[PDB]
Amino acid sequence: TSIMAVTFKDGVILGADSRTTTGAYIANRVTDKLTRVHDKIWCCRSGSAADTQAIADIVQYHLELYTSQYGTPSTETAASVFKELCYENKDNLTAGIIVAGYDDKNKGEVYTIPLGGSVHKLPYAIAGSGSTFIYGYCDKNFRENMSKEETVDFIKHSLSQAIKWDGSSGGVIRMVVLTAAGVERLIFYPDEYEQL
Amino acid sequence: SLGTSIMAVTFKDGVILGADSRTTTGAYIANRVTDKLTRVHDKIWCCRSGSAADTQAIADIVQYHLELYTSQYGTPSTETAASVFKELCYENKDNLTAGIIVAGYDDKNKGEVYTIPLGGSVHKLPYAIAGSGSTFIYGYCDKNFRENMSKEETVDFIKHSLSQAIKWDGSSGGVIRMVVLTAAGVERLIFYPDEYEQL
Amino acid sequence: GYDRALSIFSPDGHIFQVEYALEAVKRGTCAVGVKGKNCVVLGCERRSTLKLQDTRITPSKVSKIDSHVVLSFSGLNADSRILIEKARVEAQSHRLTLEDPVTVEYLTRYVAGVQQRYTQSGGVR
Amino acid sequence: TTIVGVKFNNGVVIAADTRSTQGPIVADKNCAKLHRISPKIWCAGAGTAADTEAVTQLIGSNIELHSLYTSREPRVVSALQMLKQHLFKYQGHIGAYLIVAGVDPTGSHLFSIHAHGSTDVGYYLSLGSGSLAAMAVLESHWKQDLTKEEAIKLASDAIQAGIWNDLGSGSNVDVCVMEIGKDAEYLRNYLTPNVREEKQKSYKFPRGTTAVLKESIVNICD
Amino acid sequence: SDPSSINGGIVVAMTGKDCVAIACDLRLGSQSLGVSNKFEKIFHYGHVFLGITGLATDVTTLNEMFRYKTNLYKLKEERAIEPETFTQLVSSSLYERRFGPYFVGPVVAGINSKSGKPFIAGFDLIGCIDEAKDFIVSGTASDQLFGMCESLYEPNLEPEDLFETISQALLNAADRDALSGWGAVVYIIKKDEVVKRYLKMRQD
Amino acid sequence: DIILGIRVQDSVILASSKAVTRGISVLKDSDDKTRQLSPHTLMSFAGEAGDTVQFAEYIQANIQLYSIREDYELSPQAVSSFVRQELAKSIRSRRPYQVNVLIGGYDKKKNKPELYQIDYLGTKVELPYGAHGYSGFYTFSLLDHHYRPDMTTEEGLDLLKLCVQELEKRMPMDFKGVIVKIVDKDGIRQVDDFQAQ
Amino acid sequence: MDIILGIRVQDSVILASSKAVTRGISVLKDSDDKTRQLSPHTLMSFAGEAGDTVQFAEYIQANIQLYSIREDYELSPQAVSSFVRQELAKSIRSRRPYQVNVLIGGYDKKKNKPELYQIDYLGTKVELPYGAHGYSGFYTFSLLDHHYRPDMTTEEGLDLLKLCVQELEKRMPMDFKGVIVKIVDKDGIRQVDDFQAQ
Amino acid sequence: TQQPIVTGTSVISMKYDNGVIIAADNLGSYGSLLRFNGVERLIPVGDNTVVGISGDISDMQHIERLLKDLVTENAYDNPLADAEEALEPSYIFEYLATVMYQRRSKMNPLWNAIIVAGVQSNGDQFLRYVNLLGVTYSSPTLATGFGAHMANPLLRKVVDRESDIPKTTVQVAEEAIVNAMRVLYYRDARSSRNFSLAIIDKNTGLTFKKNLQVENMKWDFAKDIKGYGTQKI
Amino acid sequence: QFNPYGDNGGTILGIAGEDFAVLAGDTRNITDYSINSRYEPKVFDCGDNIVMSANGFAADGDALVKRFKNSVKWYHFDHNDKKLSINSAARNIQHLLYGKRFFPYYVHTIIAGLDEDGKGAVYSFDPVGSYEREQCRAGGAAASLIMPFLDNQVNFKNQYEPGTNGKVKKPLKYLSVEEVIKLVRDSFTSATERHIQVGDGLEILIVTKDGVRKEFYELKRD
Amino acid sequence: TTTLAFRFQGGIIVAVDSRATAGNWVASQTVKKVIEINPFLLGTMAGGAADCQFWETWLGSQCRLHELREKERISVAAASKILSNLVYQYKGAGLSMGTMICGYTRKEGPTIYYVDSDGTRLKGDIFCVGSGQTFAYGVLDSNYKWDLSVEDALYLGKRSILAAAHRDAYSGGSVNLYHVTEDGWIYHGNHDVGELFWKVKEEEGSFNNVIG
């Protein structure tokens, strides 16, 4: 898979591909790897779908309750619960989650949680088999406080390359934009992104 | 072994080879000033990756072949040179770890680039990238490579693509070497850290 | 779960439950044993009431612990069965780890030890 | 072991410790890791001592024979090629990691060779157990256009790092200076900082202490 | 089992004034089991002495070999081989089997007849030479012998002192090695004569 | 080690090797590999070192307990049912008892001798004759031939001895001979004279 | 392994050699002779790997018989062992090593002395008064060390073996079906056919 | 039983006349991938101790969270938490060493090599090492992983024995460290040019420096190096 | 996989005088071919006139020492400040070690002090708690190089009266604290020479009826 | 190691060696391989020194509690069985031991029980345990006799550990010798094998082939 989360001036955007393989067989070619754990806190997930889904399923539960007694959780508190699960269960998990969320105070935040269970807070985060090919491109191209339409293109072009090289990545390019306005879902089909 | 960050890009006047400078054994950097650009003939060079012992022993044996060839059939095509590399890499797949890029200049063909990955296969190309650090610049290179570039532009393209590979790949580092190959002879360039990092 | 202290000291220094346990013995069928020169005998009263008993099966008052030891008793029948079972097991176990049957005292010390344990433990009479 | 090579303005200099281990046990407290290949082509070697000595000496011979055949002073690139093509031919089963250096009609030269057959070219080099300790000194101290005297220091200080900090190395320092003008000067035991302190007691025995069962004169002459 | 630990045994060699000494135990084992108290491990080719520890069959084979080589040497050259030269022969011969080496730990001892100076040398199974001036050890009790030789040795001993030293050095080492003992023999080597003495030790 | 058993007209005969070998040394040439579970029920056994006796003794003790509690003797059938039942638990146990047994008994109610073979997996089967391990391989061929269900005890002891000669002749281990025991309506006694018959 | 014993007395050399040959589960033969006569005054007992065992012994014998005839002479029981050891030395770094152990019992007619040599499969030769191969020495050597005397009469030798064989029969698990005993002296080689209940 | 994922290379330190120095590149490597560049691996605790941490970063982050809890817990019902009853190196080190050895003893180690550095209340220099195995040792110089093989050799040329500590000045000591960092940067493929350095002085107090860089490198000579033996151009 | 044990190699030695006892150990602590410290005490005074060293894997040794000292503290607290008999101390360590019989403390341990008659005592232990009273015993990396010497120079083994024929063993004459310390230093200086894990320093703790006292001597640092 | 224990009219004799090895390197030659379980019971050491030393010491503790409780000496059978049932409890856990539990009581006379870590428990008249056992069993078997005098029997024992020490590389330093009686065991000293060796060869004539 190829997944990323980029912060911009109005908030943050998550993006993913849609291909999940088992071996060289594409099990699902329209997978939704953009997984929401709270109104405006979402995540990109990589590794065993079983494990990532079970973690997301749990985190969602944890924030749902949190919200019932302490109100809206921070984008940090979300990532904390994720690490707490991943780190304290490192021995039986193969999950590489990226968390992203819009806050009203800090605006968009991005937290990446690699295999360790370690947490790193970044401006943008790329992960998944395909990300290795785009380290180069994304570093040269990312800029703080981009606009939305610029940020959408950044993702689209980046995941466009990821998909092009990684066999384990592909399908459509999904996006989920997180800002005050609300949550807006996006999709870009091959014919469109394939020739940029 | 050279692990490596190497590339060869054809442009308008010919072709430029480029490489990092670091060879590691484990995490220790055995040599941080390695010349990964190897000359098999006046204007036919290669960049080496995978087992030094192997890549050297090979470059050395190809050179010898190209030298004897030169002595009796005149000068060899970049193609003929690539062929000799592959014949060795393929016919010995079982005992080699060498990924070599072959770059040269014919007056008729100008710049040519042949990549020879592990199998021993051959692929002629506009540009090629290889080594440990090449996985990170597939995205960048492809997006910025343009055919028939100026020499100035091609050097920038390599200097940028490599700077990135060095940045992310621990197995690659040092200075950035390049060899230029045109009708005007052979030029040798080098860019130090203080320069390429700042991009 | 249930550990209330059923056997405890009353102001004058007596443990009422144990005494009331002896009272049950007082109402038991007279048991008796006398020792001979090279033998020991055990006699046991049995209520004269019902000519309607099946004497082949009705539990008999004298019980063997091992092939060489018996146990007679007085008091609550149902409690006796529980002491016998525990005794016969300790007998078979003592052979298994000492390769030799129990001395009558050892067996006794053991049984009396169990009795003592119900005076000093929680939840039990 | 700990070996190094350092280029200087009019030649090249190499050095080595003198400890020879086998497991944790020191077998020889003073052996030379410095090996002549030709009069001006010395070679420092680390790894399996039989392999460094053998491969050094074997090439040395072939170089001498060759030098006679050609009527020319042997070259350091000649010894380099013959060594790598041998070591490589062996895929590593010859445990010789060498620092070859010398002077020849084309100038002074300094190379490193690995067991597998690969070669490196440099101004300062080091190999072996101590390599890293030595190279730390070299990185911190080498500068371009060193005097012969300066390089003798730098070289020797790099070996010391090895002697002290490395357990695979110790005892004394050997050095060989190949200057372009002159003969190669081989300074054996150029340093001996590790000298055993006088013992606390003679352990010489009173004669007769040992119980003998039988004595005889052995015959040598025929 | 490591073939260098199967049979067991040791050899030691030292230098004193105008003389050299070389000793060895007499054991030949088949691991646990003692097999022979009469397996001497010290041979001579003229005035040059060779001690060999390690795999019994290889020890016998090497002696047979160096006898053979040194005989053809004496016939061709018309003179007995010297220690300096022999040590080379040893090395070359061993390295010639670099990849299927004899599992041995040989030791050379003698006085050069012309130079008259005393000489010793040792080597791993592949002929890597160690020409220490003081002493040389080898065998299943190498560890222990280093311990003794390093404390007991002193330069320029007179033969009957060198004797006492190399004897005490061998003895106490052989006695901390399960696979050595069962007797020991000591050669005191000099310009003119050689004296072989047998030692009395424990037998267990 | 050799465990054999044969059921005749009015008894059951058990033969069990006397050697105990640990390492390359035969520590003992006298071991009696049996236990009397009850007055008319005897059990031979063979298998892994400690387990062998630890199991034998555990059963014995348990049967002796049942005997006293009920003041009755369990039928040889019930005893073997119980024994299997234990070995059956062992197999999925943390560490299994690796013991093979033979249970020879005289059913005082039904007046017939009975012989039961049970391997460590809890595989019980009732036979005219049996053995464990390789003992079956050399003997069975002969027992198949001569065995008669109407045999006398003397006839049994002869066919047994013959089986012992075969083992002695063709089996590469010296087991130092067997101890023979007979279970019949009068209890169990030992044939202390099988060295010559 | 099988029992290979050897004992050198004053006038001769006695060699014991078990009679059992086993293949897996059944003892195939209770009357084997693990010995080959190499020369009138030289006998060789052998034990080890199946097949190799005889191939070797017959192969050695052939070369001695061939030598004997070529020089119309009998090799010294020492010479023969030195040759036999050399052949086992070769076998060791060989493609497939013979895994055979031997004892050479001979009577050197020149020195008028009986000699016993034990050489393992590795070519490890040692000349002894009493020898044994495999585990055989583990039981017996305690006894031989105690009772052995270089001046023993042949009958004292045979008595000492009898005591050795008994201990082997008592404490050793494998039932080796008794031993075949032979004497090598100045008159030749002959088999004590009465070693049953002597 | 585990295996490290995102990891931090070498941590180095030495002591001098008044206090101690400690340094560590700001890199979180993921195998060959020099993945995370802004990683602070020096963790100050109180105004008198800094904890240097190499090895696994997730296990490092766990120790950070652990160390802040010692502060907040030592602060509870302790009116003298900013004075005589302040956490001290001795203490901080014993707590970690404990945890570390209990973890290895549970076969679930915290995958690090740690170096505790600071100053006692009575001015004494504290400097001790602990690692995933619960091994602990002290010395005038201490370094982890690579830095053990390259930094110490150089730093021990400065403070070879106990008697050189009073003779080494903060300026001589700091120079030595900064030199070693460049060496690891020349020769440790998992190193970063950026690093953090820290000084705990009994007189000047705690001085923490971030965003440093390796300067004065020598790469000019690379241009003369050509080929691997016989090549001239 | 995670390998829980390590090896910091060091070398210790305990010698029991008639009315004294010494427990010595090198100072150098290590990991593979690298030095962790040139000074890391390994011999510790544990109270009640007892000294201890737990050489092998440092983390385990320190953890073992820590427990024993705490064990001593609590013997007082539980038995009215009673002194710990060297012999009782030994038994108590066997239990500490045996307690971890299935995850052994990977250390060869030695204690020294005075027995209940003012006689000098040294006890030696396994990694799992097997112990013996000893006259003199060395432990660790260089122990092979020390015990054969000590048999010879303390129990005068293999030594006989000159000219006796070897018929009378040298008299067992008995040594003093100053004569012993000479032997210890000689052993260690000798070992320093032939073992790469022995060097830096020597710290000797000496126990007499007057208490515990200690001496330090440098050792070669290569 | 070589350890032995036999039974005779005089009672029981126990004899062992002193050597302890770690690879080929001899660690100690002063090891008590006879364990003084209590004044009347001895055990032998083979397998794991700790395993034996630790558990047989704990056996004395258990025997002590038996006597303190039952007001009567423990039977050799009961003491042995106690160690054996403990050991079995740890089967396949790593334990290593081959021991002879020796006692002389009224009820059962002189008694020896062999007990190993496998759980095995055997009563016997003659046992040998350790690498050198086959050497010891040779001397004993041929020379054993129930009618041996305490004086001959001790010698026989000491002689067997000698035969073994000689051949076995892993046996011998000195022979610790004991004689077990109803009133208790009596320690018959330590006998250095180096010295004993020669003495015995000169007196008995034996070890004919050894020079000296």
Side-chain angles (χ1 to χ4, degrees), chain I residues 102, chain J residues 55 85-95 117:
Chain I
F102 300 116
Chain J
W55 284 113
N85 289 183
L86 181 290
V87 149
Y88 183 70
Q89 283 265 101
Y90 284 100
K91 193 171 178 171
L95 280 177
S117 65

PDB file of all heavy atoms in Angstrom, chain I residues 102, chain J residues 55 85-95 117:
ATOM      1  N   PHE I 102      17.396 -22.867  37.298  1.00  0.00           N
ATOM      2  CA  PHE I 102      16.919 -23.038  35.910  1.00  0.00           C
ATOM      3  C   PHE I 102      16.990 -21.810  35.010  1.00  0.00           C
ATOM      4  O   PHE I 102      16.604 -21.861  33.847  1.00  0.00           O
ATOM      5  CB  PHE I 102      15.574 -23.729  35.905  1.00  0.00           C
ATOM      6  CG  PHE I 102      15.621 -25.093  36.552  1.00  0.00           C
ATOM      7  CD1 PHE I 102      14.902 -25.366  37.710  1.00  0.00           C
ATOM      8  CD2 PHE I 102      16.395 -26.092  36.012  1.00  0.00           C
ATOM      9  CE1 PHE I 102      14.944 -26.606  38.308  1.00  0.00           C
ATOM     10  CE2 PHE I 102      16.459 -27.338  36.616  1.00  0.00           C
ATOM     11  CZ  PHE I 102      15.731 -27.595  37.766  1.00  0.00           C
TER      12      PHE I 102
ATOM     13  N   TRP J  55      20.517 -31.115  46.976  1.00  0.00           N
ATOM     14  CA  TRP J  55      19.348 -31.921  47.290  1.00  0.00           C
ATOM     15  C   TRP J  55      19.624 -32.946  48.365  1.00  0.00           C
ATOM     16  O   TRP J  55      18.715 -33.315  49.089  1.00  0.00           O
ATOM     17  CB  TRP J  55      18.725 -32.560  46.032  1.00  0.00           C
ATOM     18  CG  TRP J  55      17.963 -31.592  45.221  1.00  0.00           C
ATOM     19  CD1 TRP J  55      18.260 -31.143  43.973  1.00  0.00           C
ATOM     20  CD2 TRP J  55      16.793 -30.911  45.621  1.00  0.00           C
ATOM     21  NE1 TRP J  55      17.330 -30.214  43.559  1.00  0.00           N
ATOM     22  CE2 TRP J  55      16.420 -30.052  44.567  1.00  0.00           C
ATOM     23  CE3 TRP J  55      16.012 -30.934  46.776  1.00  0.00           C
ATOM     24  CZ2 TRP J  55      15.291 -29.231  44.641  1.00  0.00           C
ATOM     25  CZ3 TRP J  55      14.876 -30.117  46.849  1.00  0.00           C
ATOM     26  CH2 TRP J  55      14.531 -29.291  45.790  1.00  0.00           C
ATOM     27  N   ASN J  85      11.410 -39.313  45.019  1.00  0.00           N
ATOM     28  CA  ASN J  85      10.137 -38.733  44.657  1.00  0.00           C
ATOM     29  C   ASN J  85      10.236 -37.248  44.374  1.00  0.00           C
ATOM     30  O   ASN J  85       9.426 -36.719  43.595  1.00  0.00           O
ATOM     31  CB  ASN J  85       9.082 -38.992  45.715  1.00  0.00           C
ATOM     32  CG  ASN J  85       8.633 -40.423  45.762  1.00  0.00           C
ATOM     33  OD1 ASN J  85       7.732 -40.766  46.536  1.00  0.00           O
ATOM     34  ND2 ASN J  85       9.239 -41.284  44.943  1.00  0.00           N
ATOM     35  N   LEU J  86      11.210 -36.578  45.003  1.00  0.00           N
ATOM     36  CA  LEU J  86      11.457 -35.134  44.789  1.00  0.00           C
ATOM     37  C   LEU J  86      11.990 -34.950  43.367  1.00  0.00           C
ATOM     38  O   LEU J  86      11.422 -34.251  42.552  1.00  0.00           O
ATOM     39  CB  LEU J  86      12.456 -34.615  45.818  1.00  0.00           C
ATOM     40  CG  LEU J  86      12.833 -33.135  45.777  1.00  0.00           C
ATOM     41  CD1 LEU J  86      13.673 -32.791  44.558  1.00  0.00           C
ATOM     42  CD2 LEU J  86      11.615 -32.231  45.885  1.00  0.00           C
ATOM     43  N   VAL J  87      13.096 -35.615  43.097  1.00  0.00           N
ATOM     44  CA  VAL J  87      13.703 -35.658  41.791  1.00  0.00           C
ATOM     45  C   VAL J  87      12.691 -35.938  40.676  1.00  0.00           C
ATOM     46  O   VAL J  87      12.651 -35.232  39.690  1.00  0.00           O
ATOM     47  CB  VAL J  87      14.838 -36.693  41.851  1.00  0.00           C
ATOM     48  CG1 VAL J  87      15.055 -37.388  40.547  1.00  0.00           C
ATOM     49  CG2 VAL J  87      16.103 -36.011  42.331  1.00  0.00           C
ATOM     50  N   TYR J  88      11.851 -36.948  40.833  1.00  0.00           N
ATOM     51  CA  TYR J  88      10.849 -37.290  39.800  1.00  0.00           C
ATOM     52  C   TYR J  88       9.921 -36.123  39.495  1.00  0.00           C
ATOM     53  O   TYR J  88       9.481 -35.934  38.366  1.00  0.00           O
ATOM     54  CB  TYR J  88      10.015 -38.509  40.234  1.00  0.00           C
ATOM     55  CG  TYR J  88       9.019 -38.969  39.183  1.00  0.00           C
ATOM     56  CD1 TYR J  88       9.462 -39.584  37.990  1.00  0.00           C
ATOM     57  CD2 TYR J  88       7.643 -38.811  39.381  1.00  0.00           C
ATOM     58  CE1 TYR J  88       8.559 -40.012  37.030  1.00  0.00           C
ATOM     59  CE2 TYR J  88       6.730 -39.235  38.437  1.00  0.00           C
ATOM     60  CZ  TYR J  88       7.181 -39.829  37.265  1.00  0.00           C
ATOM     61  OH  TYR J  88       6.259 -40.257  36.331  1.00  0.00           O
ATOM     62  N   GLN J  89       9.593 -35.383  40.540  1.00  0.00           N
ATOM     63  CA  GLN J  89       8.790 -34.180  40.438  1.00  0.00           C
ATOM     64  C   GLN J  89       9.378 -33.156  39.454  1.00  0.00           C
ATOM     65  O   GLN J  89       8.655 -32.342  38.910  1.00  0.00           O
ATOM     66  CB  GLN J  89       8.726 -33.559  41.822  1.00  0.00           C
ATOM     67  CG  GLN J  89       7.769 -34.252  42.750  1.00  0.00           C
ATOM     68  CD  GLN J  89       6.457 -33.538  42.718  1.00  0.00           C
ATOM     69  OE1 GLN J  89       5.505 -33.973  42.058  1.00  0.00           O
ATOM     70  NE2 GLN J  89       6.426 -32.370  43.345  1.00  0.00           N
ATOM     71  N   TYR J  90      10.696 -33.200  39.267  1.00  0.00           N
ATOM     72  CA  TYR J  90      11.446 -32.319  38.360  1.00  0.00           C
ATOM     73  C   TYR J  90      11.928 -33.064  37.087  1.00  0.00           C
ATOM     74  O   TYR J  90      12.973 -32.724  36.486  1.00  0.00           O
ATOM     75  CB  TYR J  90      12.714 -31.821  39.091  1.00  0.00           C
ATOM     76  CG  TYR J  90      12.565 -30.748  40.133  1.00  0.00           C
ATOM     77  CD1 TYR J  90      12.554 -31.042  41.467  1.00  0.00           C
ATOM     78  CD2 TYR J  90      12.508 -29.433  39.760  1.00  0.00           C
ATOM     79  CE1 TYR J  90      12.447 -30.043  42.412  1.00  0.00           C
ATOM     80  CE2 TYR J  90      12.400 -28.430  40.682  1.00  0.00           C
ATOM     81  CZ  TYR J  90      12.372 -28.726  42.011  1.00  0.00           C
ATOM     82  OH  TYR J  90      12.261 -27.673  42.908  1.00  0.00           O
ATOM     83  N   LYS J  91      11.203 -34.098  36.687  1.00  0.00           N
ATOM     84  CA  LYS J  91      11.662 -34.879  35.571  1.00  0.00           C
ATOM     85  C   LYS J  91      11.627 -34.069  34.286  1.00  0.00           C
ATOM     86  O   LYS J  91      10.667 -33.381  33.991  1.00  0.00           O
ATOM     87  CB  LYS J  91      10.901 -36.189  35.434  1.00  0.00           C
ATOM     88  CG  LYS J  91      11.626 -37.112  34.470  1.00  0.00           C
ATOM     89  CD  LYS J  91      11.091 -38.529  34.411  1.00  0.00           C
ATOM     90  CE  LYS J  91      11.890 -39.321  33.378  1.00  0.00           C
ATOM     91  NZ  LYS J  91      11.575 -40.775  33.420  1.00  0.00           N
ATOM     92  N   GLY J  92      12.725 -34.148  33.546  1.00  0.00           N
ATOM     93  CA  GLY J  92      12.896 -33.407  32.309  1.00  0.00           C
ATOM     94  C   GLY J  92      13.045 -31.904  32.493  1.00  0.00           C
ATOM     95  O   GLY J  92      12.815 -31.143  31.563  1.00  0.00           O
ATOM     96  N   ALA J  93      13.432 -31.476  33.687  1.00  0.00           N
ATOM     97  CA  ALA J  93      13.586 -30.062  33.993  1.00  0.00           C
ATOM     98  C   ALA J  93      15.030 -29.604  33.883  1.00  0.00           C
ATOM     99  O   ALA J  93      15.294 -28.417  34.009  1.00  0.00           O
ATOM    100  CB  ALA J  93      13.090 -29.794  35.394  1.00  0.00           C
ATOM    101  N   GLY J  94      15.961 -30.527  33.665  1.00  0.00           N
ATOM    102  CA  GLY J  94      17.373 -30.182  33.626  1.00  0.00           C
ATOM    103  C   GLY J  94      18.211 -30.918  34.662  1.00  0.00           C
ATOM    104  O   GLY J  94      19.404 -31.117  34.462  1.00  0.00           O
ATOM    105  N   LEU J  95      17.602 -31.347  35.769  1.00  0.00           N
ATOM    106  CA  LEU J  95      18.356 -32.038  36.843  1.00  0.00           C
ATOM    107  C   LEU J  95      19.256 -33.118  36.331  1.00  0.00           C
ATOM    108  O   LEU J  95      18.922 -33.778  35.384  1.00  0.00           O
ATOM    109  CB  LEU J  95      17.423 -32.662  37.886  1.00  0.00           C
ATOM    110  CG  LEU J  95      16.910 -31.647  38.897  1.00  0.00           C
ATOM    111  CD1 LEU J  95      15.935 -32.303  39.868  1.00  0.00           C
ATOM    112  CD2 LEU J  95      18.095 -31.021  39.625  1.00  0.00           C
ATOM    113  N   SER J 117      18.453 -38.968  38.326  1.00  0.00           N
ATOM    114  CA  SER J 117      17.525 -37.877  38.035  1.00  0.00           C
ATOM    115  C   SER J 117      16.392 -38.318  37.167  1.00  0.00           C
ATOM    116  O   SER J 117      15.356 -37.677  37.144  1.00  0.00           O
ATOM    117  CB  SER J 117      18.230 -36.665  37.417  1.00  0.00           C
ATOM    118  OG  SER J 117      18.765 -36.979  36.157  1.00  0.00           O
TER     119      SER J 117
END
